Amino acid sequence: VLQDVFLDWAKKYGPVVRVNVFHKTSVIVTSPESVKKFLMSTKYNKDSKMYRALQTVFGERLFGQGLVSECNYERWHKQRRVIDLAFSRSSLVSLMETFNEKAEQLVEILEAKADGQTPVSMQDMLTYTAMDILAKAAFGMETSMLLGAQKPLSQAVKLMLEGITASRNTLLREVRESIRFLRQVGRDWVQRRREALKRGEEVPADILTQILKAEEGAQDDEGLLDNFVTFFIAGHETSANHLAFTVMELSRQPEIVARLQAEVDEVIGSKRYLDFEDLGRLQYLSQVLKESLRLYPPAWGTFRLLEEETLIDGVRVPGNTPLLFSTYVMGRMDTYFEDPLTFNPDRFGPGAPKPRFTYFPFSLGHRSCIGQQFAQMEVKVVMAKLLQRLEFRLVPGQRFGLQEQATLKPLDPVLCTLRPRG
Numbered sequence: 001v002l003q004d005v006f007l008d009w010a011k012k013y014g015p016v017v018r019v020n021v022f023h024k025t026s027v028i029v030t031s032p033e034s035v036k037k038f039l040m041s042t043k044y045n046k047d048s049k050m051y052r053a054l055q056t057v058f059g060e061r062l063f064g065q066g067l068v069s070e071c072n073y074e075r076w077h078k079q080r081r082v083i084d085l086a087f088s089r090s091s092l093v094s095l096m097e098t099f100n101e102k103a104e105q106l107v108e109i110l111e112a113k114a115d116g117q118t119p120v121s122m123q124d125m126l127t128y129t130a131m132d133i134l135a136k137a138a139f140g141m142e143t144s145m146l147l148g149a150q151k152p153l154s155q156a157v158k159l160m161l162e163g164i165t166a167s168r169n170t171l172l173r174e175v176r177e178s179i180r181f182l183r184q185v186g187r188d189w190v191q192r193r194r195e196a197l198k199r200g201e202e203v204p205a206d207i208l209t210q211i212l213k214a215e216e217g218a219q220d221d222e223g224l225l226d227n228f229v230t231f232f233i234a235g236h237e238t239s240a241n242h243l244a245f246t247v248m249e250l251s252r253q254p255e256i257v258a259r260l261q262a263e264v265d266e267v268i269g270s271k272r273y274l275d276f277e278d279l280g281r282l283q284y285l286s287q288v289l290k291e292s293l294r295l296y297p298p299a300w301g302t303f304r305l306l307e308e309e310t311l312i313d314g315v316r317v318p319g320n321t322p323l324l325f326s327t328y329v330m331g332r333m334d335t336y337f338e339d340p341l342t343f344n345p346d347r348f349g350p351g352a353p354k355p356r357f358t359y360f361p362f363s364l365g366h367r368s369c370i371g372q373q374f375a376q377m378e379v380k381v382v383m384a385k386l387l388q389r390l391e392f393r394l395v396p397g398q399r400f401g402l403q404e405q406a407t408l409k410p411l412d413p414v415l416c417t418l419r420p421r422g
């Protein structure tokens with residue numbers, strides 16, 4: 001993948017290198033001090049040039065000026081300030097019911113197939129789960145993709161994704177159809193929501209709540225669709241990929257798995273539901289998930305606009321330049337991580353110095369992932385429940401490896417046979 005080329009040029013040509021990404025030129029910056037400087041300061045903002053191909057796609061607007069697309073600091077801080085509320089400790093804690101429900105449903109579906117012969121795309125399974133969690137926790141809707149439902153909606157997302165890929169690398173407008181379908185799904189849910197809140201009905205505190213709250217005084221509900229499609233995608237795709245990677249990797253780490261089983265047996269035993277309080281105790285699982293994001297971050301990095309020509313690690317960089325930051329790249333440099341290709345959870349063990357600006361799967365600073373804790377909670381619940389109940393062996397001819405689509409994800413879907421643990 002392209003990221004591997006950047007890795008090689010970073011190792012070979014130093015901490016500051018000019019490259020072509022998405023057919024614009026920019027400078028990839030791979031020193032931790034530069035990461036700190038540019039990401040930990042409100043002075044530096046996203047580069048609208050890089051994000052415009054995501055703002056709109058093949059004529060149909062997609063993410064618009066959503067919470068991710070929006071580059072202007074002030075328009076952004078307005079949205080963020082209110083959407084933050086849907087992510088407070090109390091909000092997250094009230095999500096445990098949704099996470100538990102969906103994870104249990106997944107484990108049940110999978111146990112039904114666990115004869116050691118039926119192959120299963122863990123990639124697909126993990127995606128339906130992530131989408132079901134997101135759809136309910138964010139918008140209060142049941143999609144039931146784990147149970148065969150909303151197949152069209154599933155296809156839209158699928159194509160809408162391939163679309164974005166092409167939209168920004170191409171050296172079949174089902175895509176435009178899809179982008180529209182998605183936006184209409186949004187219109188419908190936003191609607192079902194208003195229609196219930198004008199039956200004066202008691203609806204609890206969602207992400208959806210806050211996005212509407214932030215689109216007040218808006219002549220159109222077009223920015224409200226922006227945010228809808230934004231969370232709808234941001235909120236399931238990278239989590240599903242993160243899951244898929246972790247499972248791909250674990251299938252060839254029997255020792256790691258043993259220690260994880262051991263751990264989950266103690267912390268949760270055989271209870272069906274994890275309590276919010278249990279998550280904190282899943283120390284070692286948490287290390288595994290970190291080491292997974294280091295080698296396989298679904299979101300490889302971010303861009304910032306350098307406006308004043310500045311000096312960067314002894315290199316004059318011209319003003320108006322897109323700076324590229326890559327956690328994928330840094331994760332794989334022997335300069336920052338000893339023996340980088342080796343998957344080792346102890347890197348994050350208690351007592352190890354935390355990586356210092358060389359690891360940022362959720363990015364850093366004011367534009368960091370608003371959903372970080374949400375995703376870390378969700379991901380522990382699903383992994384815990386898998387570890388508690390199943391064993392996964394990978395089917396022959398499945399490659400370990402990676403592809404650079406809209407985000408990084410496993411090269412092959414992750415085909416496995418399953419046995420009940422025992």
Ligand code: HEM
Nearest residue numbers: 067068234235238239242299302361362363369370371375
């Ligand atoms: C393991 C999963 C996830 C990873 C690795 C991840 C990663 C990050 C990263 C690297 C960005 C991009 C920063 C940039 O483009 O400069 C991002 C932004 C963001 N993420 Fe996630 N994310 C994950 C899950 C979530 C979830 C579950 C949600 C939604 C509930 C979400 C919502 C967003 C949003 C809205 C932003 C933009 C925030 C802002 O600029 O204010 N993410 N995240």
